[PDB]
C-alpha cells in the first residue's frame, strides 16, 4: 500500500502518497527486532476516520 | 510541425485507476496552459481539468473532485492526468488542449479558445 | 498493479509429471529472485525451489532433489518449475514468490521475506 496511486486502510487513512511521486519506498523485515513473545502492542493503527 | 499526442487510454474496471499522458513535439509546452477535455457518447465536450503554464493554478470539473489529479513536467514537456475511483460515467474520448489565458486573472476556471488539440484517446470504464 | 500469477495445476498420477508457470504483470520479473513454496494439508509453508534473478544460482529442497527442475525466461517474464516423479507427499497448494536477496553471497539457500505473493495453484497427486 506504500506506492503512489494506491488505496487501502493505510493508503487512504494513514499516509496518502500523491500520484506524482519522486523518490524510493524501501522496506525490510523486523521479526527479530520489533516482535516480542507476549506481543508488541506499542504500534497503534487507525481504522476509522471521518 | 506542432503536435499534441495523448497516451495511456484503455479499458479499466470501475473503482480502478488509469493515468493519461499528453506530450508535445515541435514546440515547448511549458509556456502553454493545458486542459483535459472529454466527450461522452451522446454528450458535448466538457472540461475535466486544467493546469497553468507554471503549474501554480489548477481547476477541475465538479464531477471529478477528489478523484482526478492533474500535473505537468515542464522539463519533460508533458502534462499528466491521473484518474482514481473511476466510474462508468467517465467513459469518453479524452483530448489534451494547449492555449493561453484570454482573460485577466491567474485562475484557469474560465473556458476560452484552445490553440492546439490532440487526436484524443479512449478510456472505457465497464464492469 | 504488480501481480504474480501461477498456472498449470491439476490432478496427476503418482510417478507422472506436471509443469507450473509463474507469470508477472505490471513489473519486470527478471531483476527478482523467484521461489516456489508449498503448504501441505496440516503442514506449514516450505521452500521447495528458488532461482536467482539471472538464473545462475538455484536451490532445491532435499525432498525434491533429482525430481524438480526450476527454470526461468527473462525475455518472456516467466519462471517455470518442472515436476517429475510426483508422489502423494507432493499434494498441496503451489505458491510462487518474488523477492530480492536479503543477505550477502550469491546463493539463494537461505530464506527471507518475500515481497510479492500470488494466489497459487493446486497440485494433487493421488492414485
mmCIF file of C-alpha atoms in Angstrom:
data_model
loop_
_atom_site.group_PDB
_atom_site.id
_atom_site.type_symbol
_atom_site.label_atom_id
_atom_site.label_comp_id
_atom_site.label_asym_id
_atom_site.label_seq_id
_atom_site.Cartn_x
_atom_site.Cartn_y
_atom_site.Cartn_z
ATOM 1 C CA UNK A 1 0.000 0.000 0.000
ATOM 2 C CA UNK A 2 3.033 2.339 0.148
ATOM 3 C CA UNK A 3 3.237 3.461 -3.501
ATOM 4 C CA UNK A 4 1.554 6.290 -5.454
ATOM 5 C CA UNK A 5 -1.998 5.929 -6.708
ATOM 6 C CA UNK A 6 -2.969 3.118 -4.320
ATOM 7 C CA UNK A 7 -5.852 2.618 -1.898
ATOM 8 C CA UNK A 8 -6.385 0.722 1.343
ATOM 9 C CA UNK A 9 -6.609 1.496 5.027
ATOM 10 C CA UNK A 10 -3.016 2.739 5.201
ATOM 11 C CA UNK A 11 -3.039 4.340 1.745
ATOM 12 C CA UNK A 12 -6.364 6.142 2.329
ATOM 13 C CA UNK A 13 -6.364 6.839 6.083
ATOM 14 C CA UNK A 14 -2.804 6.740 7.394
ATOM 15 C CA UNK A 15 -0.485 8.387 4.855
ATOM 16 C CA UNK A 16 -1.536 9.313 1.325
ATOM 17 C CA UNK A 17 1.050 9.215 -1.452
ATOM 18 C CA UNK A 18 0.363 11.540 -4.403
ATOM 19 C CA UNK A 19 0.359 10.192 -7.940
ATOM 20 C CA UNK A 20 3.418 12.276 -8.864
ATOM 21 C CA UNK A 21 5.986 10.789 -6.503
ATOM 22 C CA UNK A 22 9.749 11.228 -6.905
ATOM 23 C CA UNK A 23 11.792 9.053 -4.563
ATOM 24 C CA UNK A 24 12.012 5.488 -3.289
ATOM 25 C CA UNK A 25 9.995 3.200 -0.999
ATOM 26 C CA UNK A 26 12.318 0.819 0.800
ATOM 27 C CA UNK A 27 11.318 -1.809 3.363
ATOM 28 C CA UNK A 28 12.513 -4.926 5.153
ATOM 29 C CA UNK A 29 11.523 -7.291 7.968
ATOM 30 C CA UNK A 30 11.885 -6.643 11.709
ATOM 31 C CA UNK A 31 10.740 -10.033 13.002
ATOM 32 C CA UNK A 32 13.724 -10.449 15.345
ATOM 33 C CA UNK A 33 13.818 -6.773 16.341
ATOM 34 C CA UNK A 34 10.265 -5.479 16.839
ATOM 35 C CA UNK A 35 8.319 -8.613 17.852
ATOM 36 C CA UNK A 36 8.069 -9.980 21.390
ATOM 37 C CA UNK A 37 6.846 -13.280 22.807
ATOM 38 C CA UNK A 38 3.885 -11.617 24.512
ATOM 39 C CA UNK A 39 3.144 -9.392 21.525
ATOM 40 C CA UNK A 40 4.390 -5.860 20.828
ATOM 41 C CA UNK A 41 1.342 -3.580 21.009
ATOM 42 C CA UNK A 42 3.242 -0.268 21.080
ATOM 43 C CA UNK A 43 2.338 0.396 17.420
ATOM 44 C CA UNK A 44 -1.221 1.704 17.072
ATOM 45 C CA UNK A 45 -3.286 1.759 13.875
ATOM 46 C CA UNK A 46 -6.387 3.711 12.873
ATOM 47 C CA UNK A 47 -9.295 2.018 11.112
ATOM 48 C CA UNK A 48 -11.983 4.744 11.252
ATOM 49 C CA UNK A 49 -11.782 8.371 10.130
ATOM 50 C CA UNK A 50 -14.296 10.975 9.008
ATOM 51 C CA UNK B 1 5.073 20.630 -37.015
ATOM 52 C CA UNK B 2 3.302 21.408 -33.742
ATOM 53 C CA UNK B 3 1.815 18.180 -32.383
ATOM 54 C CA UNK B 4 -0.126 17.189 -29.273
ATOM 55 C CA UNK B 5 -0.299 13.453 -28.564
ATOM 56 C CA UNK B 6 -2.385 11.682 -25.923
ATOM 57 C CA UNK B 7 -1.464 8.306 -24.459
ATOM 58 C CA UNK B 8 -2.477 5.907 -21.708
ATOM 59 C CA UNK B 9 -6.044 5.160 -22.774
ATOM 60 C CA UNK B 10 -7.564 1.737 -22.330
ATOM 61 C CA UNK B 11 -10.207 -0.360 -20.595
ATOM 62 C CA UNK B 12 -10.397 -0.367 -16.790
ATOM 63 C CA UNK B 13 -12.646 -1.686 -14.034
ATOM 64 C CA UNK B 14 -14.877 0.798 -12.179
ATOM 65 C CA UNK B 15 -13.163 1.739 -8.945
ATOM 66 C CA UNK B 16 -9.774 1.193 -10.580
ATOM 67 C CA UNK B 17 -7.211 3.741 -11.694
ATOM 68 C CA UNK B 18 -5.801 4.915 -15.017
ATOM 69 C CA UNK B 19 -3.212 7.528 -15.980
ATOM 70 C CA UNK B 20 -3.059 9.590 -19.175
ATOM 71 C CA UNK B 21 -0.169 11.453 -20.789
ATOM 72 C CA UNK B 22 -0.032 14.385 -23.198
ATOM 73 C CA UNK B 23 3.262 15.028 -24.985
ATOM 74 C CA UNK B 24 4.175 17.944 -27.244
ATOM 75 C CA UNK B 25 6.560 17.900 -30.205
ATOM 76 C CA UNK B 26 7.724 20.791 -32.368
ATOM 77 C CA UNK B 27 7.242 23.367 -29.593
ATOM 78 C CA UNK B 28 7.844 23.968 -25.886
ATOM 79 C CA UNK B 29 4.766 23.009 -23.844
ATOM 80 C CA UNK B 30 5.821 24.852 -20.669
ATOM 81 C CA UNK B 31 4.557 28.311 -21.707
ATOM 82 C CA UNK B 32 1.079 26.980 -22.579
ATOM 83 C CA UNK B 33 -1.810 26.214 -20.262
ATOM 84 C CA UNK B 34 -3.131 22.682 -20.770
ATOM 85 C CA UNK B 35 -6.620 21.323 -20.184
ATOM 86 C CA UNK B 36 -8.026 17.808 -20.400
ATOM 87 C CA UNK B 37 -11.358 17.532 -22.214
ATOM 88 C CA UNK B 38 -13.686 14.591 -22.808
ATOM 89 C CA UNK B 39 -16.838 13.898 -24.806
ATOM 90 C CA UNK B 40 -19.156 11.134 -23.641
ATOM 91 C CA UNK B 41 -21.305 9.150 -26.103
ATOM 92 C CA UNK B 42 -24.169 11.488 -26.919
ATOM 93 C CA UNK B 43 -22.718 14.382 -24.890
ATOM 94 C CA UNK B 44 -20.825 17.619 -25.531
ATOM 95 C CA UNK B 45 -17.111 18.146 -24.870
ATOM 96 C CA UNK B 46 -16.779 19.085 -21.195
ATOM 97 C CA UNK B 47 -13.740 20.383 -19.343
ATOM 98 C CA UNK B 48 -12.299 17.781 -16.983
ATOM 99 C CA UNK B 49 -9.198 19.501 -15.606
ATOM 100 C CA UNK B 50 -6.815 22.335 -16.454
ATOM 101 C CA UNK B 51 -3.378 23.424 -15.237
ATOM 102 C CA UNK B 52 -1.470 26.684 -15.632
ATOM 103 C CA UNK B 53 1.734 27.064 -17.633
ATOM 104 C CA UNK B 54 3.843 27.138 -14.459
ATOM 105 C CA UNK B 55 1.537 24.662 -12.700
ATOM 106 C CA UNK B 56 0.650 27.045 -9.866
ATOM 107 C CA UNK B 57 -3.050 27.189 -10.794
ATOM 108 C CA UNK B 58 -5.450 24.312 -11.452
ATOM 109 C CA UNK B 59 -9.162 23.739 -11.999
ATOM 110 C CA UNK B 60 -11.270 20.563 -12.135
ATOM 111 C CA UNK B 61 -14.890 19.777 -13.022
ATOM 112 C CA UNK B 62 -17.142 19.133 -10.019
ATOM 113 C CA UNK B 63 -17.835 15.581 -11.207
ATOM 114 C CA UNK B 64 -14.159 14.688 -10.646
ATOM 115 C CA UNK B 65 -13.112 16.482 -7.427
ATOM 116 C CA UNK B 66 -11.235 14.138 -5.122
ATOM 117 C CA UNK B 67 -10.744 11.608 -7.924
ATOM 118 C CA UNK B 68 -8.607 13.163 -10.676
ATOM 119 C CA UNK B 69 -5.230 14.861 -10.242
ATOM 120 C CA UNK B 70 -3.617 16.960 -12.980
ATOM 121 C CA UNK B 71 0.038 17.969 -13.160
ATOM 122 C CA UNK B 72 2.808 18.674 -15.639
ATOM 123 C CA UNK B 73 6.549 18.268 -16.155
ATOM 124 C CA UNK B 74 7.970 21.340 -17.882
ATOM 125 C CA UNK B 75 11.417 19.737 -18.159
ATOM 126 C CA UNK B 76 9.998 16.685 -19.965
ATOM 127 C CA UNK B 77 7.449 18.774 -21.934
ATOM 128 C CA UNK B 78 4.498 16.685 -20.722
ATOM 129 C CA UNK B 79 1.237 17.136 -18.819
ATOM 130 C CA UNK B 80 -0.239 14.255 -16.821
ATOM 131 C CA UNK B 81 -3.760 13.387 -15.667
ATOM 132 C CA UNK B 82 -4.202 10.692 -13.011
ATOM 133 C CA UNK B 83 -7.645 9.100 -12.654
ATOM 134 C CA UNK B 84 -8.698 7.309 -9.458
ATOM 135 C CA UNK B 85 -12.029 5.812 -8.344
ATOM 136 C CA UNK B 86 -13.028 5.631 -11.986
ATOM 137 C CA UNK B 87 -16.739 5.360 -12.825
ATOM 138 C CA UNK B 88 -18.858 4.311 -15.837
ATOM 139 C CA UNK B 89 -19.931 7.961 -16.173
ATOM 140 C CA UNK B 90 -16.363 8.763 -17.290
ATOM 141 C CA UNK B 91 -16.337 6.547 -20.406
ATOM 142 C CA UNK B 92 -15.285 9.042 -23.080
ATOM 143 C CA UNK B 93 -12.577 10.123 -25.504
ATOM 144 C CA UNK B 94 -10.051 12.380 -23.764
ATOM 145 C CA UNK B 95 -8.293 15.264 -25.526
ATOM 146 C CA UNK B 96 -5.495 17.474 -24.251
ATOM 147 C CA UNK B 97 -5.597 21.072 -25.469
ATOM 148 C CA UNK B 98 -2.986 23.813 -25.102
ATOM 149 C CA UNK B 99 -3.841 27.516 -25.130
ATOM 150 C CA UNK B 100 -3.092 30.850 -23.479
ATOM 151 C CA UNK B 101 -5.138 32.854 -20.995
ATOM 152 C CA UNK B 102 -7.522 35.140 -22.887
ATOM 153 C CA UNK B 103 -8.750 36.908 -19.731
ATOM 154 C CA UNK B 104 -7.216 38.770 -16.837
ATOM 155 C CA UNK B 105 -6.659 36.800 -13.575
ATOM 156 C CA UNK B 106 -4.388 33.852 -12.795
ATOM 157 C CA UNK B 107 -7.049 31.094 -12.391
ATOM 158 C CA UNK B 108 -7.972 28.818 -15.292
ATOM 159 C CA UNK B 109 -11.597 28.206 -14.289
ATOM 160 C CA UNK B 110 -12.996 30.027 -17.325
ATOM 161 C CA UNK B 111 -13.056 28.488 -20.796
ATOM 162 C CA UNK B 112 -11.729 30.150 -23.943
ATOM 163 C CA UNK B 113 -10.096 29.345 -27.265
ATOM 164 C CA UNK B 114 -7.816 26.303 -27.306
ATOM 165 C CA UNK B 115 -4.922 26.833 -29.693
ATOM 166 C CA UNK B 116 -3.726 23.254 -30.195
ATOM 167 C CA UNK B 117 -5.522 19.932 -29.823
ATOM 168 C CA UNK B 118 -4.547 16.279 -29.820
ATOM 169 C CA UNK B 119 -6.246 13.411 -31.602
ATOM 170 C CA UNK B 120 -7.766 12.062 -28.379
ATOM 171 C CA UNK B 121 -7.506 8.781 -26.506
ATOM 172 C CA UNK B 122 -10.217 6.348 -25.423
ATOM 173 C CA UNK B 123 -10.787 5.340 -21.799
ATOM 174 C CA UNK B 124 -13.668 2.921 -21.203
ATOM 175 C CA UNK B 125 -14.977 2.082 -17.725
ATOM 176 C CA UNK B 126 -17.187 -1.008 -17.628
ATOM 177 C CA UNK B 127 -17.734 -3.910 -15.219
ATOM 178 C CA UNK C 1 -0.744 -3.165 -10.440
ATOM 179 C CA UNK C 2 2.032 -5.608 -9.561
ATOM 180 C CA UNK C 3 0.600 -9.114 -9.915
ATOM 181 C CA UNK C 4 2.070 -12.624 -9.990
ATOM 182 C CA UNK C 5 0.013 -15.482 -11.436
ATOM 183 C CA UNK C 6 0.633 -19.215 -11.086
ATOM 184 C CA UNK C 7 -0.705 -21.728 -13.596
ATOM 185 C CA UNK C 8 -0.508 -25.379 -14.591
ATOM 186 C CA UNK C 9 -2.025 -27.000 -11.511
ATOM 187 C CA UNK C 10 -4.221 -30.059 -11.715
ATOM 188 C CA UNK C 11 -4.634 -33.714 -10.791
ATOM 189 C CA UNK C 12 -1.900 -36.183 -11.763
ATOM 190 C CA UNK C 13 -0.967 -39.822 -11.190
ATOM 191 C CA UNK C 14 1.940 -40.664 -8.856
ATOM 192 C CA UNK C 15 5.027 -41.222 -10.958
ATOM 193 C CA UNK C 16 3.663 -38.813 -13.564
ATOM 194 C CA UNK C 17 4.789 -35.312 -14.446
ATOM 195 C CA UNK C 18 3.391 -31.784 -14.316
ATOM 196 C CA UNK C 19 4.675 -28.293 -15.097
ATOM 197 C CA UNK C 20 3.850 -24.947 -13.495
ATOM 198 C CA UNK C 21 4.350 -21.449 -14.863
ATOM 199 C CA UNK C 22 4.677 -18.263 -12.803
ATOM 200 C CA UNK C 23 3.950 -15.077 -14.753
ATOM 201 C CA UNK C 24 4.184 -11.431 -13.711
ATOM 202 C CA UNK C 25 2.251 -8.366 -14.878
ATOM 203 C CA UNK C 26 2.816 -4.669 -14.223
ATOM 204 C CA UNK C 27 6.523 -5.108 -13.400
ATOM 205 C CA UNK C 28 9.625 -6.791 -14.801
ATOM 206 C CA UNK C 29 10.381 -10.170 -13.206
ATOM 207 C CA UNK C 30 13.997 -10.513 -14.382
ATOM 208 C CA UNK C 31 15.518 -8.466 -11.532
ATOM 209 C CA UNK C 32 13.853 -10.568 -8.813
ATOM 210 C CA UNK C 33 14.723 -13.913 -7.300
ATOM 211 C CA UNK C 34 11.769 -16.297 -7.590
ATOM 212 C CA UNK C 35 10.962 -19.186 -5.272
ATOM 213 C CA UNK C 36 8.309 -21.889 -5.320
ATOM 214 C CA UNK C 37 6.586 -22.604 -1.999
ATOM 215 C CA UNK C 38 4.013 -25.127 -0.802
ATOM 216 C CA UNK C 39 1.611 -25.637 2.107
ATOM 217 C CA UNK C 40 0.630 -29.275 2.595
ATOM 218 C CA UNK C 41 -2.647 -30.100 4.385
ATOM 219 C CA UNK C 42 -1.848 -29.736 8.066
ATOM 220 C CA UNK C 43 1.697 -28.502 7.369
ATOM 221 C CA UNK C 44 3.415 -25.127 7.150
ATOM 222 C CA UNK C 45 4.699 -23.384 4.017
ATOM 223 C CA UNK C 46 8.034 -24.871 2.929
ATOM 224 C CA UNK C 47 10.587 -23.760 0.359
ATOM 225 C CA UNK C 48 10.859 -26.253 -2.492
ATOM 226 C CA UNK C 49 12.921 -24.459 -5.136
ATOM 227 C CA UNK C 50 14.261 -20.948 -5.736
ATOM 228 C CA UNK C 51 16.232 -19.483 -8.647
ATOM 229 C CA UNK C 52 18.357 -16.321 -8.881
ATOM 230 C CA UNK C 53 17.486 -13.208 -10.871
ATOM 231 C CA UNK C 54 19.869 -14.134 -13.704
ATOM 232 C CA UNK C 55 19.318 -17.853 -13.104
ATOM 233 C CA UNK C 56 22.956 -18.614 -12.317
ATOM 234 C CA UNK C 57 22.049 -19.795 -8.803
ATOM 235 C CA UNK C 58 19.424 -22.319 -7.710
ATOM 236 C CA UNK C 59 18.452 -24.291 -4.633
ATOM 237 C CA UNK C 60 16.210 -27.305 -4.073
ATOM 238 C CA UNK C 61 14.559 -28.891 -1.071
ATOM 239 C CA UNK C 62 16.075 -32.291 -0.317
ATOM 240 C CA UNK C 63 12.649 -33.921 -0.737
ATOM 241 C CA UNK C 64 12.536 -32.928 -4.427
ATOM 242 C CA UNK C 65 16.213 -33.112 -5.434
ATOM 243 C CA UNK C 66 16.599 -35.100 -8.628
ATOM 244 C CA UNK C 67 12.858 -34.695 -9.258
ATOM 245 C CA UNK C 68 12.143 -30.977 -9.652
ATOM 246 C CA UNK C 69 13.724 -28.595 -12.164
ATOM 247 C CA UNK C 70 13.336 -24.817 -11.934
ATOM 248 C CA UNK C 71 13.989 -22.542 -14.903
ATOM 249 C CA UNK C 72 13.123 -19.023 -15.999
ATOM 250 C CA UNK C 73 12.960 -16.844 -19.109
ATOM 251 C CA UNK C 74 13.771 -13.170 -18.551
ATOM 252 C CA UNK C 75 12.601 -12.313 -22.077
ATOM 253 C CA UNK C 76 9.100 -13.735 -21.533
ATOM 254 C CA UNK C 77 8.933 -12.576 -17.881
ATOM 255 C CA UNK C 78 8.220 -16.069 -16.534
ATOM 256 C CA UNK C 79 9.616 -18.685 -14.163
ATOM 257 C CA UNK C 80 8.841 -22.371 -14.654
ATOM 258 C CA UNK C 81 9.014 -25.409 -12.408
ATOM 259 C CA UNK C 82 9.151 -28.864 -13.993
ATOM 260 C CA UNK C 83 7.733 -31.678 -11.834
ATOM 261 C CA UNK C 84 8.821 -35.277 -12.452
ATOM 262 C CA UNK C 85 8.234 -38.465 -10.434
ATOM 263 C CA UNK C 86 5.473 -36.873 -8.367
ATOM 264 C CA UNK C 87 4.435 -38.532 -5.105
ATOM 265 C CA UNK C 88 1.405 -38.367 -2.785
ATOM 266 C CA UNK C 89 3.657 -36.375 -0.438
ATOM 267 C CA UNK C 90 3.518 -33.706 -3.178
ATOM 268 C CA UNK C 91 -0.180 -32.850 -2.693
ATOM 269 C CA UNK C 92 -0.601 -29.194 -1.655
ATOM 270 C CA UNK C 93 -1.216 -25.679 -2.967
ATOM 271 C CA UNK C 94 1.697 -24.332 -5.014
ATOM 272 C CA UNK C 95 2.760 -20.719 -4.449
ATOM 273 C CA UNK C 96 5.210 -18.573 -6.438
ATOM 274 C CA UNK C 97 7.042 -15.645 -4.827
ATOM 275 C CA UNK C 98 9.445 -12.920 -5.937
ATOM 276 C CA UNK C 99 11.899 -11.033 -3.728
ATOM 277 C CA UNK C 100 15.452 -9.689 -3.540
ATOM 278 C CA UNK C 101 18.303 -11.442 -1.740
ATOM 279 C CA UNK C 102 18.383 -10.441 1.930
ATOM 280 C CA UNK C 103 21.984 -11.480 2.648
ATOM 281 C CA UNK C 104 25.478 -11.255 1.259
ATOM 282 C CA UNK C 105 26.523 -14.160 -1.036
ATOM 283 C CA UNK C 106 25.147 -15.281 -4.398
ATOM 284 C CA UNK C 107 23.353 -18.477 -3.202
ATOM 285 C CA UNK C 108 19.605 -18.474 -2.548
ATOM 286 C CA UNK C 109 19.704 -21.285 0.027
ATOM 287 C CA UNK C 110 18.669 -19.007 2.894
ATOM 288 C CA UNK C 111 15.104 -17.790 3.370
ATOM 289 C CA UNK C 112 13.839 -14.266 3.966
ATOM 290 C CA UNK C 113 10.859 -12.032 3.360
ATOM 291 C CA UNK C 114 9.084 -12.361 0.015
ATOM 292 C CA UNK C 115 7.925 -9.038 -1.405
ATOM 293 C CA UNK C 116 5.262 -10.326 -3.808
ATOM 294 C CA UNK C 117 2.952 -13.328 -3.485
ATOM 295 C CA UNK C 118 0.447 -14.903 -5.855
ATOM 296 C CA UNK C 119 -2.880 -16.602 -5.270
ATOM 297 C CA UNK C 120 -1.450 -20.043 -6.020
ATOM 298 C CA UNK C 121 -2.410 -23.223 -7.838
ATOM 299 C CA UNK C 122 -3.408 -26.659 -6.564
ATOM 300 C CA UNK C 123 -1.269 -29.720 -7.312
ATOM 301 C CA UNK C 124 -2.837 -33.045 -6.309
ATOM 302 C CA UNK C 125 -1.054 -36.390 -6.708
ATOM 303 C CA UNK C 126 -3.317 -39.345 -5.928
ATOM 304 C CA UNK C 127 -3.711 -42.887 -7.275
#
